Every structure is written in structure tokens, then in C-alpha cells.
Amino acid sequence: CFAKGTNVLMADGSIECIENIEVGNKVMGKDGRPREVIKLPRGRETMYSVVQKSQHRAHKSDSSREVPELLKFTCNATHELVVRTPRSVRRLEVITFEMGQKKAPDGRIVELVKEVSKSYPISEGPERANELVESYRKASNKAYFEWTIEARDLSLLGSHVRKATYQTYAPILYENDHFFDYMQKSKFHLTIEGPKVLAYLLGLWIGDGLSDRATFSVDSRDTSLMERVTEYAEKLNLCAEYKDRKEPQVAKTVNLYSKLNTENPLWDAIVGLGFLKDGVKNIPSFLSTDNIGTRETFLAGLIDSDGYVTDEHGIKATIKTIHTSVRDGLVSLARSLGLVVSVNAEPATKHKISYAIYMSGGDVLLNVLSKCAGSKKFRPAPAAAFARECRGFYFELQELKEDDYYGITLSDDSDHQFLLANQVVVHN
Amino acid sequence: CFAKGTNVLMADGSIECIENIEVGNKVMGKDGRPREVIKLPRGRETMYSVVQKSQHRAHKSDSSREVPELLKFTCNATHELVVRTPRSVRRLEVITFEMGQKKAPDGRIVELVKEVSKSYPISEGPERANELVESYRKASNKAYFEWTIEARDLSLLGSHVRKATYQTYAPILYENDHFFDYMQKSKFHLTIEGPKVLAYLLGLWIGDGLSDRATFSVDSRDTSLMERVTEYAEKLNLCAEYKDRKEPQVAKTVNLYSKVLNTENPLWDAIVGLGFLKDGVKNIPSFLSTDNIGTRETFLAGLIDSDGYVTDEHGIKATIKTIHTSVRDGLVSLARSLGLVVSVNAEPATKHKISYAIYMSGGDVLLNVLSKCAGSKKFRPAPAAAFARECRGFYFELQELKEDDYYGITLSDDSDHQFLLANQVVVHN
């Protein structure tokens, strides 16, 4: 039901092209648990591509710097989109969104959400109206409809319903212990200290450190940070040497020697784990399926050196970077936690393009900021427990036709949905 | 008990200087209900200025071009601030925000919110650890504390708690009906749909209308918005004439002529009559903020449909751009009166040295405005159910000031002892 090349998420965090998946294989379920592939449907059908609706767009040339907003895929016409639409009722001419049906041009009857209206004489008194809205309100335990519509049928939706309809991506709940295992692979388990502490400092590294030694800036900005870098460095048996600034009276130098900066455990980790790529900084892919607390700590560290926290219309954290490797790696990482992300190519020693990355998520973001030590960056942890939920995204569908499609069908015993490599929740 | 000149919101939506209030007058309560004044505390005391934390401040006997910070007031040292603090538990050594106590420099023991740590033994298991936490999580239905603290005791707060603590403003639930009354008392127009279509039309005009007649812009690419304008201008007994280009090919000019652009038409008369064109300059009249809610909402939908944009990105949000200082100020107050979160940002462009971008958010509160829009990318369905227009918080800076006279009011023995300042901030007598 997908085009050749479509990357899907395997039950182990590995990415795999739809066409190379075999019977017996296990893909990733929205719950972080596996889904077994039992058959591999193949055929030819008109295809449709799904692309997230943007605002600030241009990407479609490999001339570089065109943000590759991961959320998109191509599927065949009969492939079922996993969609949601909010419930809605207006007045008390009470208008509501309700599941209904419509005959398609080819004769088929399709079940779909429809804009419905009921109106009676003002003369007849508001009795019937209030029973309508109250009734509508009792009709469900959710503030949205969760359902599916084959790609070819989306055009049947009326405008209001179509625009309000969105697909979703799921946080990656599955967790690996690669950070842990890399730590074991350099002497290990004897005495406290773990991956969150290293992840934090590595976060600081990407944020504003030097790409040639285990050394980064600090100075002040949030000041309280310093006591933590020493305490954390200390936890990793390293040592933090502070020097004479490293930015017009705003940043410093902190060398993390082995209780150096080269033949060191940290820069080993840096270039060893993948944080330094082609002479440029980058946040690794394993991160996205690692331990959640580790992911949050790496992020807390990154927010601490080069992040901007805001409260105005909800918490939001912003990171600017020129490296596309960092950009792409951060969007993946944040999304795996269940945060909402949007990048923005904007203006900018002298250099061309700069990337602004904003993350939101309420309690999900509060869980990250609570791990920060920077004065204007820390925000109290959530009040209560919280579920990392699927986030929605509005999209545009495009008819393409032609082509061969590749599908995998999961067991009937299961909830026939799994995750593409971009975290989008898809059906068979 | 505040500084002289502090404007209080009266029970009828009117406004009065605190030194002018008298025993028996009724101020506005946060539920839209009155609160009677029973006493008038006067005195001289050290004063404290409360101002919202923003990049703004603006006018004090000068120009209006800078965006001012309107959320503020000057109270005395002992005045109790109505504040909120979120609840929070961290790690699973556990840290929580809790109601506690502290002793002031004088004798006084003041109950305040405190950050608290809990840690101890190894191997015992997920008992106490995941316990302290789960407990904390069930501890309340509310995700915040609601308490008061005198201005002078604010500095007793820890750093985390202090920065996390904020004040609140309440929507204006109270509704006059000066708009409907204008219409009924005036010109020529049967209602039922009347105040809705008019307010909407006045929204489009404020957004991009000519300052001397009933003409405005409308996106040409938008069929349903053009339909809407026709449909509503018709309900008002007006005839809408579209003209190719009211902006280099993007918008069409719309002329609103009376049926059978200044004289003998409902739109221009209401513009002049209700104060939207205050002596040559556009304005969003104050009455609007204490008027019928549906009307305030429709008017906003009109503005949004005219010179605004909606984004879903990180939460539903609407932005309205205006080059007019008066529209800017009236808009901030109108939006807050509904319970929307609002922020203004000064921006760039013969040309205009500066324009103002005003951002609005507030989940269902905003969705109720948007569902009245006809613009293709503006409209968003009405809420899924009934919602509450809750108070909105704001972080603030407190500064100890001069000793000066103070004017306070005392509300009924046993009542919530809370009322609204003219800027909607929730105050304790």
C-alpha cells in the first residue's frame, strides 16, 4: 500500500524500506511493541503522496538547505489513512460534525465525518435545540472522531471537515540502551553515574562547544549552569577547567579533562557516538530510540547552551543552528519524545543560512526543561502523570497514479497499525 | 488598597478611579456579578508597583507609538496579591511544590508555596519513591495552587517558586447591550441576525476600510468569503459592489451601498455613531469590551477575515496586524475581555515606520471566534462541547516604592473579597 523506498520503523528501532521487509518480520506499533508481518501484498494502483501542510515552504530542489519536513509518504489509492477530526457543535440551526456516509462517483457508499445541520422554527421554542447539543455532547467520551478513509475517498469530504481532518505521528516509546552499552564499552558498572549525565554534557557540546576538543562555552547567560557542569563532569570523573571568556562577555571556555580533551572519554564519546560528523556537529539517530530520560537530558543540555525558552502562548523552546545535521537530528529526537516541532530557515562569522527550531508539548516539554540548570531555562516538572500522545498534522494529498506498491499485512489478532520511519501512524 | 488613579471595573462595566468609589457602589467580581463596597480604607504606606514581565511599558505623558504594558497596578506594602503557582513533583530524592510556612523579618509566619525534597534508603524498592509521587499526583484535581501573599512577603519566596508564581486576569462575563440598543434605537433595521452581521461588517472595515466611506478589501481568491460579505451586506439591507483590485491583485474592493456610501446607510452611520471612526481616525470603542460576547466574537472574526492569519503550528493562534495605535489598544482589551491570551509585537513597514502584530490564543475561547469566520484559512470548527472562559495568568515584576497615600475598598463580610481592576487583573480588597 506504500511506494517503493518508503522507510518503515522496525520493532527494534531500525529503519527498513517497505520492499525489503519479509514475512515473519516485526514492525513498530504505536505502543512501542511489535507487530508481526504475515503477508506482503503487491500490485499496481494509482498512487497518492501525502505531504504535511506547511506555511513557509520551498523544498523540492536538492540545492541543499531546503528543510526536508519528514512527514510525508506515498501510498496507493485504496490505502486507508488513519485520521482524526474534532467533534464540533455550533449554536444552542445547530450544526455538528458526525459520522455519516456519501455515495462515491463510482457507486460505493463511504462512511465519513460530515458537517450536519438541523433547523426548526424559532417559534417552536429552544427545547429541541438544547436536546440536540446536549445529546451531541453525551454522544461521546472523546473530543474527536478517530477513523480511516482510503486515499481515493478524501476528496469526498466537505471543505470544513476536510480542513479539520489530520493524521498523526506517535512518540517512540520503545527504548534501547545503546548509550548505556557504549558506556560499558569503556569500563563500567561499578559506582553510580550514568547516561543522562554524559548525555547532558554531550548536549552542552552540540549547543556551543568546540568541534575539535571536549571543550565548550558557558560564562553566564544562566550562571547556575557552571555549578552543574562541574558536578556533572565530576560524576563522570572528568574535570572542568574554566578560562577567560569565549564570546563578547557572554560565553566561556570549560575543558573537561580526565581526572586532555583529546585522548579523553568525552571526545571519544563525541566522535565515537556520532555527535561529530563530517567536521560538523550532529545529533545521532540512535538517540531517537534510546532511553527516554537520556533523550530528555541530552535536550536539557542543548537547551542550556544555545536555547531560548518562552512562556507567552504556551511553553516553547528554540534552538538555532546552521548545521543541517543538527537540525534534522533535533527534529527526530524531539518528535520521538512526543514534542511538536517546526523549523524555519531565516537570516543569519559571516555565513548564509540559519535554522530556527521551535519545540512545544506542554508537560512533555516541561519534563525536559525541568532537567535544565540554566536560570531562564528551567521550568518546574509537570503537576501530575502524563501520557506522551500522538500529535496531529494537517496535510495535502496529491494524485499521482501509475506505479507498483508494496504492503505488509500484520496479524488479525492485532491492531493493524504501525509506524513509518517518520513516526506517522499508518494502517496495513 | 492601591495608589491614587487606579482604575477599577465597576459592576456595570464602567470605570472609576479608586479614590472616587463610595460606600454602596458595586465593583465587578470575576464571575461577572457585582461586589458591594462596605468600607473605604485610607492611609499612608510604602507602595509597591506590579507590572507584567514584557519587553513593553510605553506611555507616561507622551506618545502612543510604543506598545505599553497594561497589566499593572500600584498597591501598598501589605496588600495581598492573588497569585497562582503550578503544582509539581520531580524525579520518579524527590522535589515538590507544597503549601508551607515561613517566618518574616518581623514576627509574622506566612503560609506560602515551597519547593521540598524527599530522599533516603537503598534497595527498599519502588515503595516510597514512586509513592511520594503518585500520591502527589492524586493530591489534587487542580494542577496549581491558588493563594495570596502580601506584596512585602513576596521576596520570602524561593527562586523556583517565585519565578513560577503569577497573577491573573479574568474575562469580562458581564454583558451590556449598547450595540443592540444602538441598532434598535437607530436607522432602519430588524435584527435576529442583525448585530451579528453588523459587528462582522464593522470588523472587516476596521481591518482594511477606507476612512471616509463604507468601502473595504476582501480576498479575491476567496469565494465563500465573498459570498459571506454579499449575504451579510444583504441582511443589513446593503448592496455590495466588488471591484477588481483593492490591493495589487490579491484583494477586491467592496463598496457597501444602501439597497432599493456615507449617508443613508447602516454601516457608515454605525461607524460614526458607535465611535469606530473617532474624528478621522479608526478606533475600537471601549463599550465593546463589556458588550454582548457573541458580538465581540463576530467583530473579531471580521478583523481576522480582513487583515489576519491563523496558525495551528504549536496551538491554534490568530494574528491581527494594524498600523493604528488606537485599534491596537482597543484590540488588546477586547481580546482579553473574552479570556484570550494576548501579546503585541511592534514590526516594520509612502511607508509606515511601524506596524503592530497582535497575537491571540486560548483554545476553545479562540475557536469560538474562528468558527464565526468565513475565510478559507481562518475558519476552525466551533468547540466540541461547552467550555469555560477561565482566568489567564501573567508573570510579573514587583518593585518597592515610595511611601504615599493608599485608597482601598472593602467588600461584603464573607464573599470572595475579590474584584476586577479596569485592566481585568484579579485583586483582593
UniProtKB/Swiss-Prot annotation, chain B:
Annotated consequence of substituting residue 1 to S: Reduces splicing reaction speed. Inhibits splicing
Residue ranges constituting the DOD-type homing endonuclease domain according to the UniProt record: 201-340
Name of the protein this chain belongs to: Endonuclease PI-SceI
Organism: Saccharomyces cerevisiae (strain ATCC 204508 / S288c)
Gene: VMA1
Residues of the full protein shown: 284 to 737 of 1071
